[PDB]
Amino acid sequence: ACGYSDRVLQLTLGNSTITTQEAANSVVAYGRWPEYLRDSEANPVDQPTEPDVAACRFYTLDTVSWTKESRGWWWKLPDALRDMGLFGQNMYYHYLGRSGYTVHVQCNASKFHQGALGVFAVPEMCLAGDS
Amino acid sequence: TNPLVPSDTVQTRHVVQHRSRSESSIESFFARGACVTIMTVDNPASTTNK
């Protein structure tokens, strides 16, 4: 009717906005939107810091390059954001922290290109060593 | 002894406490068999001097 679509989205968090015109809907992992820690599940008793828009905003990491020889890439969270603005500062000044995330992976090309990237979010992504 | 809790000296959030002292009641602290002795006995041949 108005033309709203699965493929066309806008995400706004803090002072940052993402737009996309070729999305394939979006995933909410295990059907659970992020939330603050409920009192009935709480554990440290000190009044928590909640940075809100200072840290809950889009941070863009260094771009990588996909070629025919690429085997794949990995990042860990919160680690990949450890040096990101006030999120990073609040993380390092406190013993404890919790956080959810919106992850937006971007990769455009053309109607004459082809290829497919699996983007997986893995809880406790333990990786194997080299020894 | 000064009966303080954390909200007396820092800012605190609300927390619904679920822990209990069930395992440190006097009964539970002592609810175990402990070895108090080892007694030795034997059954020797009838020809023993001992």
PDB file of C-alpha atoms in Angstrom, chain A:
ATOM      1  CA  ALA A   1       0.000   0.000   0.000  1.00  0.00           C
ATOM      2  CA  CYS A   2       2.575   2.572   1.198  1.00  0.00           C
ATOM      3  CA  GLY A   3       5.338   0.307  -0.200  1.00  0.00           C
ATOM      4  CA  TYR A   4       6.915  -0.773   3.147  1.00  0.00           C
ATOM      5  CA  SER A   5       9.219  -3.745   2.587  1.00  0.00           C
ATOM      6  CA  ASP A   6      11.375  -6.499   4.086  1.00  0.00           C
ATOM      7  CA  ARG A   7      14.178  -5.386   1.989  1.00  0.00           C
ATOM      8  CA  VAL A   8      14.194  -1.741   2.996  1.00  0.00           C
ATOM      9  CA  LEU A   9      15.035  -0.954   6.608  1.00  0.00           C
ATOM     10  CA  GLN A  10      16.188   1.860   8.815  1.00  0.00           C
ATOM     11  CA  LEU A  11      17.918   1.236  12.186  1.00  0.00           C
ATOM     12  CA  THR A  12      18.509   4.109  14.596  1.00  0.00           C
ATOM     13  CA  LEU A  13      20.470   3.833  17.878  1.00  0.00           C
ATOM     14  CA  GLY A  14      21.816   6.833  19.797  1.00  0.00           C
ATOM     15  CA  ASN A  15      23.106   9.390  17.321  1.00  0.00           C
ATOM     16  CA  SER A  16      23.445   6.801  14.551  1.00  0.00           C
ATOM     17  CA  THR A  17      21.286   5.512  11.739  1.00  0.00           C
ATOM     18  CA  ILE A  18      21.707   2.690   9.242  1.00  0.00           C
ATOM     19  CA  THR A  19      19.683   2.371   6.073  1.00  0.00           C
ATOM     20  CA  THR A  20      19.477  -0.560   3.710  1.00  0.00           C
ATOM     21  CA  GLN A  21      17.552  -1.133   0.516  1.00  0.00           C
ATOM     22  CA  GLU A  22      18.472  -4.802  -0.054  1.00  0.00           C
ATOM     23  CA  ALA A  23      17.906  -6.536   3.257  1.00  0.00           C
ATOM     24  CA  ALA A  24      16.535 -10.046   3.746  1.00  0.00           C
ATOM     25  CA  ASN A  25      14.432  -9.177   6.828  1.00  0.00           C
ATOM     26  CA  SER A  26      16.472  -9.293  10.085  1.00  0.00           C
ATOM     27  CA  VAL A  27      17.118 -11.877  12.791  1.00  0.00           C
ATOM     28  CA  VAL A  28      16.435 -11.630  16.525  1.00  0.00           C
ATOM     29  CA  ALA A  29      18.610 -14.396  17.985  1.00  0.00           C
ATOM     30  CA  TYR A  30      16.581 -17.078  19.763  1.00  0.00           C
ATOM     31  CA  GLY A  31      13.585 -14.719  19.566  1.00  0.00           C
ATOM     32  CA  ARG A  32      15.000 -12.615  22.437  1.00  0.00           C
ATOM     33  CA  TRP A  33      15.396  -8.870  22.142  1.00  0.00           C
ATOM     34  CA  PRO A  34      18.134  -7.406  24.413  1.00  0.00           C
ATOM     35  CA  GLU A  35      17.138  -6.283  27.872  1.00  0.00           C
ATOM     36  CA  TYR A  36      18.478  -4.806  31.082  1.00  0.00           C
ATOM     37  CA  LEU A  37      19.070  -7.173  33.997  1.00  0.00           C
ATOM     38  CA  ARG A  38      15.862  -7.776  35.941  1.00  0.00           C
ATOM     39  CA  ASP A  39      15.844  -7.406  39.707  1.00  0.00           C
ATOM     40  CA  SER A  40      14.772 -11.005  40.140  1.00  0.00           C
ATOM     41  CA  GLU A  41      17.907 -12.167  38.287  1.00  0.00           C
ATOM     42  CA  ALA A  42      20.300  -9.575  39.637  1.00  0.00           C
ATOM     43  CA  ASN A  43      23.521 -10.378  41.401  1.00  0.00           C
ATOM     44  CA  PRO A  44      26.139  -7.567  42.116  1.00  0.00           C
ATOM     45  CA  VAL A  45      24.307  -5.248  44.531  1.00  0.00           C
ATOM     46  CA  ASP A  46      25.952  -1.956  43.684  1.00  0.00           C
ATOM     47  CA  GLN A  47      23.980   0.501  41.564  1.00  0.00           C
ATOM     48  CA  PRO A  48      25.005  -0.287  37.928  1.00  0.00           C
ATOM     49  CA  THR A  49      26.218   2.171  35.324  1.00  0.00           C
ATOM     50  CA  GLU A  50      24.008   2.256  32.246  1.00  0.00           C
ATOM     51  CA  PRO A  51      25.647   4.455  29.548  1.00  0.00           C
ATOM     52  CA  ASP A  52      22.624   4.339  27.265  1.00  0.00           C
ATOM     53  CA  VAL A  53      23.206   6.500  24.062  1.00  0.00           C
ATOM     54  CA  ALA A  54      26.862   7.084  24.911  1.00  0.00           C
ATOM     55  CA  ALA A  55      27.607   3.429  24.224  1.00  0.00           C
ATOM     56  CA  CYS A  56      24.442   2.010  22.597  1.00  0.00           C
ATOM     57  CA  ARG A  57      25.122   3.253  19.117  1.00  0.00           C
ATOM     58  CA  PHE A  58      26.602   1.976  15.857  1.00  0.00           C
ATOM     59  CA  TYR A  59      30.378   1.531  15.765  1.00  0.00           C
ATOM     60  CA  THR A  60      32.005   0.660  12.396  1.00  0.00           C
ATOM     61  CA  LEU A  61      35.049  -1.610  12.484  1.00  0.00           C
ATOM     62  CA  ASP A  62      37.882  -1.641   9.911  1.00  0.00           C
ATOM     63  CA  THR A  63      36.679  -2.893   6.553  1.00  0.00           C
ATOM     64  CA  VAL A  64      38.007  -6.146   5.118  1.00  0.00           C
ATOM     65  CA  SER A  65      38.255  -7.372   1.550  1.00  0.00           C
ATOM     66  CA  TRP A  66      36.572 -10.455   0.042  1.00  0.00           C
ATOM     67  CA  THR A  67      38.449 -12.172  -2.784  1.00  0.00           C
ATOM     68  CA  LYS A  68      38.327 -15.573  -4.483  1.00  0.00           C
ATOM     69  CA  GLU A  69      40.937 -16.785  -2.007  1.00  0.00           C
ATOM     70  CA  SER A  70      39.207 -15.619   1.211  1.00  0.00           C
ATOM     71  CA  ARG A  71      38.497 -18.476   3.628  1.00  0.00           C
ATOM     72  CA  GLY A  72      36.519 -16.455   6.168  1.00  0.00           C
ATOM     73  CA  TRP A  73      36.684 -14.029   9.079  1.00  0.00           C
ATOM     74  CA  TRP A  74      35.870 -14.044  12.810  1.00  0.00           C
ATOM     75  CA  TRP A  75      35.427 -11.516  15.607  1.00  0.00           C
ATOM     76  CA  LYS A  76      34.493 -11.864  19.286  1.00  0.00           C
ATOM     77  CA  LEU A  77      32.131  -9.642  21.341  1.00  0.00           C
ATOM     78  CA  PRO A  78      32.673  -7.560  23.467  1.00  0.00           C
ATOM     79  CA  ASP A  79      36.352  -7.820  22.329  1.00  0.00           C
ATOM     80  CA  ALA A  80      35.890  -6.284  18.844  1.00  0.00           C
ATOM     81  CA  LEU A  81      34.381  -3.206  20.506  1.00  0.00           C
ATOM     82  CA  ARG A  82      36.913  -2.851  23.336  1.00  0.00           C
ATOM     83  CA  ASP A  83      38.425   0.290  21.880  1.00  0.00           C
ATOM     84  CA  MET A  84      35.106   1.824  20.730  1.00  0.00           C
ATOM     85  CA  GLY A  85      34.316   5.194  22.304  1.00  0.00           C
ATOM     86  CA  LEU A  86      32.485   5.234  25.611  1.00  0.00           C
ATOM     87  CA  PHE A  87      31.522   1.574  25.334  1.00  0.00           C
ATOM     88  CA  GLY A  88      35.202   0.662  25.565  1.00  0.00           C
ATOM     89  CA  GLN A  89      35.839   3.051  28.467  1.00  0.00           C
ATOM     90  CA  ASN A  90      32.894   1.767  30.487  1.00  0.00           C
ATOM     91  CA  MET A  91      34.006  -1.812  29.823  1.00  0.00           C
ATOM     92  CA  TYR A  92      37.548  -1.257  31.103  1.00  0.00           C
ATOM     93  CA  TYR A  93      36.587   0.851  34.152  1.00  0.00           C
ATOM     94  CA  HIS A  94      34.292  -1.829  35.552  1.00  0.00           C
ATOM     95  CA  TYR A  95      34.870  -5.350  36.803  1.00  0.00           C
ATOM     96  CA  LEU A  96      31.546  -6.518  35.390  1.00  0.00           C
ATOM     97  CA  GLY A  97      29.481  -5.857  32.336  1.00  0.00           C
ATOM     98  CA  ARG A  98      26.714  -7.201  30.170  1.00  0.00           C
ATOM     99  CA  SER A  99      25.475  -6.150  26.781  1.00  0.00           C
ATOM    100  CA  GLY A 100      23.390  -7.241  23.845  1.00  0.00           C
ATOM    101  CA  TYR A 101      24.142  -6.073  20.234  1.00  0.00           C
ATOM    102  CA  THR A 102      22.777  -5.209  16.831  1.00  0.00           C
ATOM    103  CA  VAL A 103      25.258  -6.609  14.283  1.00  0.00           C
ATOM    104  CA  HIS A 104      25.004  -5.264  10.738  1.00  0.00           C
ATOM    105  CA  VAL A 105      27.245  -6.827   8.100  1.00  0.00           C
ATOM    106  CA  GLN A 106      27.524  -4.890   4.842  1.00  0.00           C
ATOM    107  CA  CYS A 107      28.592  -6.174   1.425  1.00  0.00           C
ATOM    108  CA  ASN A 108      27.251  -4.888  -1.861  1.00  0.00           C
ATOM    109  CA  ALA A 109      28.278  -5.793  -5.377  1.00  0.00           C
ATOM    110  CA  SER A 110      26.330  -5.806  -8.673  1.00  0.00           C
ATOM    111  CA  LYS A 111      23.773  -7.852 -10.570  1.00  0.00           C
ATOM    112  CA  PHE A 112      26.667  -9.453 -12.445  1.00  0.00           C
ATOM    113  CA  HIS A 113      28.577 -10.549  -9.347  1.00  0.00           C
ATOM    114  CA  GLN A 114      27.827 -13.729  -7.419  1.00  0.00           C
ATOM    115  CA  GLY A 115      28.774 -15.261  -4.114  1.00  0.00           C
ATOM    116  CA  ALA A 116      27.310 -15.982  -0.699  1.00  0.00           C
ATOM    117  CA  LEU A 117      28.512 -15.269   2.829  1.00  0.00           C
ATOM    118  CA  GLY A 118      27.210 -17.176   5.844  1.00  0.00           C
ATOM    119  CA  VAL A 119      27.032 -14.733   8.800  1.00  0.00           C
ATOM    120  CA  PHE A 120      26.773 -16.663  12.040  1.00  0.00           C
ATOM    121  CA  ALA A 121      26.463 -15.435  15.614  1.00  0.00           C
ATOM    122  CA  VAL A 122      27.748 -18.124  17.977  1.00  0.00           C
ATOM    123  CA  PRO A 123      27.310 -18.044  21.822  1.00  0.00           C
ATOM    124  CA  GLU A 124      30.660 -19.091  23.449  1.00  0.00           C
ATOM    125  CA  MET A 125      32.540 -19.384  20.150  1.00  0.00           C
ATOM    126  CA  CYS A 126      35.521 -21.344  21.472  1.00  0.00           C
ATOM    127  CA  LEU A 127      38.122 -21.798  18.730  1.00  0.00           C
ATOM    128  CA  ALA A 128      40.756 -24.484  18.240  1.00  0.00           C
ATOM    129  CA  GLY A 129      44.435 -23.817  18.824  1.00  0.00           C
ATOM    130  CA  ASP A 130      47.456 -24.305  16.607  1.00  0.00           C
ATOM    131  CA  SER A 131      49.229 -26.896  18.736  1.00  0.00           C
TER     132      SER A 131
END
